[PDB]
Design a protein around this nucleic acid. Structure first.
Ligand SMILES: [Mg+2]
Ligand SMILES: [Mg+2]
Ligand SMILES: [Mg+2]
Ligand SMILES: [Mg+2]
Ligand SMILES: [Mg+2]
Ligand SMILES: [Mg+2]
Ligand SMILES: [Mg+2]
Ligand SMILES: [Mg+2]
Ligand SMILES: [Mg+2]
Ligand SMILES: [Mg+2]
Ligand SMILES: [Mg+2]
Ligand SMILES: [Mg+2]
Lengths: 215, 205, 195, 110, 177, 48
RNA sequence: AAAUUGCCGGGAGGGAAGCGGAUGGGGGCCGGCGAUGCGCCCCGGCGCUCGGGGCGUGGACUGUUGUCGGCCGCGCCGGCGGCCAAAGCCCGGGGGCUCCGCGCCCCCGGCAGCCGUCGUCGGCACGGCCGGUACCCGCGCGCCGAAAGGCGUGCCCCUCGGGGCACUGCGCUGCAACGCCCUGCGGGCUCUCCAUCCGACCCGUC
RNA sequence: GUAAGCAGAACUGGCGAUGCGGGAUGAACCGGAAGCCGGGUUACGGUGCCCAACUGCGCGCUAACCUAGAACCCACAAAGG
RNA sequence: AUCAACUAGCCCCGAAAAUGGAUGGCGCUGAAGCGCGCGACCCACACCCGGCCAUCUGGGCGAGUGCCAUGCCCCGAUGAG
């Protein structure tokens, strides 16, 4: 219904409703409000020679990426790129930036609760029942890096010293993975053989055609 | 013909009873694609058109020699392996680096010289006599053609292939026995596993 | 646009009604021939007879794969008979006319070519002729109207794509297997691949 | 085979680099031709259309800690009736590149 | 499914003229590939038989005929006029096929093969169903027997679709009829 | 979807009969064949 | 200076070399080859700039993904109509054929399953190339909603679902997210050599 | 003119002055005339290998113990069996 | 069950030249020949969309916040020598 949606959105009356010009006929009496003259700073510190153009605070409000039809909270994905390729994970929930949020769990797979792009995953037809996992604590800030300054060039005394020390991933993430993998193993033992499944990794051995291979 | 695209280090061809030119085009494209091929039992390649026709074609080919220096002219080969290698070179572009690198991947033999006995010898369906020649039309074996254009090793291939066939037959009998005892093992383990093996009931034959 | 859709539908149903009526009455109804042709040129501009060159400069087919709308009258159809090995032509239907005029519609405005991406450009090029909209223009072409001369000399010779799915031989007449000449209705099945 | 060393998962479907987009007398080195192991139909490449490949080779000198180089590309569209594909690369391939093997992953997957 | 020919019937007459204000009416049964080719053949036969040209003629009706029972085999006869390289001749051809429409295809193919005669050279004078026990040709007559049985001397070995086909195969195929 | 009165009585039996008769008459005249009582030389070849 | 020659270092050579278009591998080479600054803000002195600290950001090239446009390509699906529609299926009837391909052929009438050919309306899934916004779109001026988005009044319509229309105003108006590298064994080069592929006859001239 | 890839005319187009795709090769035969690039689709001609595209789906005829035969011009075959 | 004539497809006989030799080559025989078709497919600087250069055409820019006005901006087509 892409084009029916196009017309239904495109109606002048429906655009009145959508922009909500009522409740703009509410506040300023029985009429549409005036607008005024901002920008009375009158204090330019320096005058560029080129014709000046201000910063773009972008007013375009892009649509959200559409999560694939074959993705359900609880679906066993297939990672495809990066250090966890072949790893089979379980999809927790497609988070607010658009990226998928998956888990090993780390007790069996070594794949922590981590962010994965939707492009690099192949949803399998199997599901798990996980409506009693409490995932609300995960978001973009949990994962946002605050990547540090490039003044630290990794030298012969940094190489294994970072391995040998622990100034790394924090202990609240340590405890996090414990709570999620507990409440998710309690959901995996239900599905027979699934722990062994997830323990395996998908390998496209000889005589395997992906166009033929279902998932 | 674009190739199979298969992944073997070497693919052998039991070239018994295949059309010379058809096997030659299939193999020539495999070489140009870059997959290393080895064709054996070339002494058996069947050619359409009767033996007398293939004869006169080859004896016309004998006339073609450089007048002022025969040592420089068309080099007429006799052995079936070299007949095949020339028929395939006529199909590969062999005056460029790509084409000569292609022919570097071809190795053609009469018989099956070791280590090509203990191996699976793959036949190319698009070229077999049964599938490309109507039964009852003239054909000749490149072994007979060379035996009559003067390749003096038809006998010496023949004793060696009699020896190789008997040495293969004894080992095939041994593998029959080993496979019937593997089959009794097949059923012995199946009867020892019950519901452990239900999942393979619908996808087995 | 409402009453154009209405009358198109009425004409299409009415033809069926008269054909059944004539059959039940015993004889048969003979459809009233097409008033309009779509003509698209299918040969390059090299090695042409000069008469043919002038005829194609008047039919406005001055480059391979141009497609123009033509009235059927005796002068025009005997002008097509002269350049027949060079053209492919027939009787466009409603979808053909509308989607050509939308998807490939350009206007000879001030001798300049304007992409009719809005109703406005009609208002300047036409409108002295009581054509205000793209649907007015489509109608007044398809049901060949009194102002069809002006509503067609307004249009620019449609630039078509090369025929997807290929083509047959362009050297023979369609009857002999080729592409030139009448394909009376099949110019419909062709415009979908020239567009 | 058993008790082997090498890669432990194949997440890519191997193929040969086949030539270029050629007429009978031209090359357009921009679009290469690629054969995938296992595709035998023009509509079987429908599922590969878009999936990304890598030409992996190795030069004479170390760079960034390796001899290995890799030039990236992707399956644009089908070519012919037997599942040969046309591949578009960031840089056009070497002509020694044809006959060698190229890796077709499934990354940009659907 | 699709048929390369279709048996139309075309009905036409000369243009109205002051005398003979209802010119007489001609019907024909023509094979062609579509409408416009059937029409163009109709004017051919009414300009070499009835002295009427497309300019000085008018076409009133064209119907596409179809077949009664596509499910049953019908022994067809075709009486046909054709042009050899050095003259003209007249042939009679008996076919077994489920439709006259397929029989015409088979007949153009036979004239293009047995005699290198193309379509522009062939005319179908009369077509009819010559039911069994009255057929003339031996190759038609030899399928008029229940309790018929014959094995398949010619059977292409071929994978069911283009996917399942590879270039090397271990085993020489087992062919048996 | 649930088998409502989807297209019901639209025309009566006398009309649906005469329409079928007119159609079959046109079919008879549309597949009608020639007499061939003209060509006295190719009678035996044409069968009539 | 050039043609020409020697040594030194490198490169390549199966009956020419040279040239053009691709990149690939070698070299030689480029730091304007590629950034570290902007606002707020707290002193401590010299509202304005520098010295310290907190503060959100921010740079060449390159990669990926997303979302809108544009053009395009490919695949699958559903409805409608025309056609005498035809057909098998379900029932009924109607003729010749005489031992026959014989439980043979042909035709006509009823009915309420799917099934050609053109025409046409619609749904979607996939991909390829280009663009990325001063207007077309879009955003704020209200609330709810992290968010796609929803939310009002009055008329017309069928009246379930729900749909159509409506009064319209000010201003603003360069799409995003995350990366990789940063004096490097890096980046890429229009310079050099070489290999491979395609092209490729020796210029002036009657 | 016996004819000529000959000599002289009529209508038009081409080459000359013009690249490019096809006819293996060719100034004028077939397609088609162009700024420099990215994307799509075609014309002529093709899909066994050289060589990009099917050893595709069909039906017939030919069996050549002469170099069977295999492209508009075009690189011929005749009378006759 | 058959006898004779006529006819026309492919093949054959007719059919001979000198450097070794040319359906372009190899080869091809339910063809990879011949005749007719069907689905796709491959291929030009040709057709379409898009970017850019230039030529041409047609417009905009002063009680000037005003400009290499010989400039800038917009529209359209075209590009062989
Ligand atoms: Mg040479
Ligand atoms: Mg296509
Ligand atoms: Mg064509
Ligand atoms: Mg010097
Ligand atoms: Mg030296
Ligand atoms: Mg060079
Ligand atoms: Mg370089
Ligand atoms: Mg898009
Ligand atoms: Mg002179
Ligand atoms: Mg292109
Ligand atoms: Mg090829
Ligand atoms: Mg000017």
């Amino acid at each position: 219904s892409k084009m029916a949606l196009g017309i239904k959105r495109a109606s002048r009356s429906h655009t009145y409703h959508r922009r909500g010009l009522w409740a703009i006929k509410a506040k300023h009496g029985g009429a549409l409000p005036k607008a005024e003259k901002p920008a009375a700073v009158a204090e330019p510190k320096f005058y560029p020679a080129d014709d000046v153009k201000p910063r773009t605070v972008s007013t375009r409000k892009p649509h959200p990426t559409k999560l694939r039809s074959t993705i359900t909270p609880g679906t066993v994905l297939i990672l495809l790129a990066g250090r966890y390729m072949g790893k089979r994970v379980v999809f927790l929930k497609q988070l607010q930036s658009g990226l998928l949020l998956i888990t090993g769990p780390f007790k069996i797979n070594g794949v922590p609760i981590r962010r994965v792009n939707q492009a690099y995953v192949i949803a399998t037809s199997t599901k798990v029942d996980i409506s009693k996992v409490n995932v609300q604590k995960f978001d973009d800030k949990y994962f946002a890096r605050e990547k540090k300054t490039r003044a630290k060039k990794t030298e012969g005394e940094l190489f294994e010293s970072d391995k040998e020390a622990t100034k790394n991933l924090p202990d609240f993430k340590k405890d996090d993975q414990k709570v999620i993998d507990a409440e998710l193993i309690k959901a995996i033992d239900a599905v027979p053989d699934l722990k062994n499944y997830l323990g395996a990794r998908f390998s496209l051995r000889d005589g395997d055609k992906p166009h033929e291979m279902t998932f | 013909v674009s190739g199979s695209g298969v992944c073997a280090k070497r693919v052998v061809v039991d070239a018994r009873h295949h059309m010379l030119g058809r096997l030659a085009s299939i193999v020539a494209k495999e070489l140009l694609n870059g997959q290393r091929v080895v064709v054996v039992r070339c002494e058996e390649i069947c050619m359409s058109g009767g033996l007398v026709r293939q004869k006169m074609k080859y004896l016309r080919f004998l006339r073609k020699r450089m007048n002022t220096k025969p040592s420089h002219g068309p080099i007429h080969f006799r052995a079936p392996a070299k007949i095949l290698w020339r028929t395939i070179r006529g199909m590969i572009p062999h005056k460029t680096a790509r084409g000569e690198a292609a022919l570097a991947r071809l190795k053609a033999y009469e018989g099956v010289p070791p280590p090509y006995d203990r191996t699976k010898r793959m036949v190319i369906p698009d070229a077999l006599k049964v599938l490309r020649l109507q039964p009852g039309h003239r054909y000749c074996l490149l072994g007979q053609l060379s035996k009559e254009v003067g390749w003096n090793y038809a006998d010496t291939i023949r004793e060696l292939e009699e020896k190789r066939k008997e040495k293969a037959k004894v080992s095939y009998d041994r593998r029959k026995q080993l496979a019937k005892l593997r089959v009794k093992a097949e059923k012995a383990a199946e009867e020892k596993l019950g519901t452990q093996l239900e999942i393979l009931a619908p996808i087995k034959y | 646009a409402e009453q154009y859709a209405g009358e198109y539908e009425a004409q299409d149903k009415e033809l069926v009604q008269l054909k059944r009526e004539a059959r039940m009455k015993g004889g048969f109804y003979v459809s009233p021939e097409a008033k309009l042709l779509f003509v698209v040129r299918i040969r390059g501009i090299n090695a042409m007879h000069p008469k043919t060159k002038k005829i194609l400069q008047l039919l406005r087919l001055r480059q391979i794969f141009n497609g123009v709308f033509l009235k059927v009258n005796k002068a025009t159809i005997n002008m097509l008979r002269r350049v027949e090995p060079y053209v492919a032509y027939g009787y466009p239907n409603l979808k053909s006319v509308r989607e050509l005029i939308y998807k490939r519609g350009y206007g000879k405005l001030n001798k300049q070519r304007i992409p009719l991406a809005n109703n406005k450009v009609i208002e300047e090029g036409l409108g002295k002729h009581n054509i205000i909209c793209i649907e007015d223009l489509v109608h007044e072409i398809l049901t060949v109207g009194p102002h069809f001369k002006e509503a067609n000399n307004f249009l620019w010779p449609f630039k078509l794509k090369a025929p997807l799915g290929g083509l047959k031989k362009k050297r023979n007449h369609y009857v002999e297997g080729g592409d030139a000449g009448n394909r009376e209705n099949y110019i419909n099945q062709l415009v979908r691949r020239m567009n | 085979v058993k008790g082997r060393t090498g890669q432990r998962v194949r997440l890519y479907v191997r193929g040969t680099i086949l030539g270029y987009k050629r007429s009978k007398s031209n090359q357009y080195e921009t679009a290469s031709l690629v054969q995938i192991e296992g595709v035998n139909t023009r509509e079987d490449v429908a599922w590969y259309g878009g999936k990304r490949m890598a030409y992996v080779y190795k030069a004479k000198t170390k760079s960034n800690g390796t001899h290995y180089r890799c030039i990236w590309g992707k399956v644009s569209r089908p070519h012919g009736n037997t599942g040969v594909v046309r591949a578009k690369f960031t840089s056009n391939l070497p002509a020694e590149a044809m006959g060698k093997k190229v890796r077709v992953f499934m990354y940009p997957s659907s | 499914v699709a048929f390369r020919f279709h048996q139309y019937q075309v009905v036409g007459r000369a243009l109205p003229t002051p005398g003979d204000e209802q010119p007489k009416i001609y019907r024909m049964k023509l094979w062609a590939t579509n409408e416009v080719r059937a029409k163009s053949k109709f004017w051919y036969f009414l300009r070499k038989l009835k002295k009427v040209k497309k300019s000085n003629g008018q076409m009133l009706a064209i119907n596409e005929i179809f077949e009664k029972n596509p499910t049953t085999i019908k022994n067809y006869g075709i009486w046909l006029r054709y042009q050899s390289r050095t003259g003209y001749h007249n042939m009679y051809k008996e076919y077994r096929d489920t439709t006259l429409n397929g029989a015409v295809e088979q007949m153009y193919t036979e004239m293009a093969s047995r005699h290198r005669v193309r379509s522009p050279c062939i005319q179908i004078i009369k077509t009819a169903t010559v039911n069994f026990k009255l057929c003339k040709r031996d190759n038609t007559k030899q399928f008029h027997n229940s309790k018929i049985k014959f094995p398949l001397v010619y059977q292409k070995v071929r994978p069911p679709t283009r996917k399942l086909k590879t270039t090397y195969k271990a085993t020489r195929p087992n062919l048996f009829m | 979807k649930e088998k409502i009165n989807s297209k019901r009585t639209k025309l009566s039996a006398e009309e649906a009969s005469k329409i079928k008769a007119a159609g079959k008459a046109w079919y008879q005249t549309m597949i009608s064949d020639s007499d061939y009582t003209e060509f006295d030389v190719f009678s035996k070849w044409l069968g009539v």
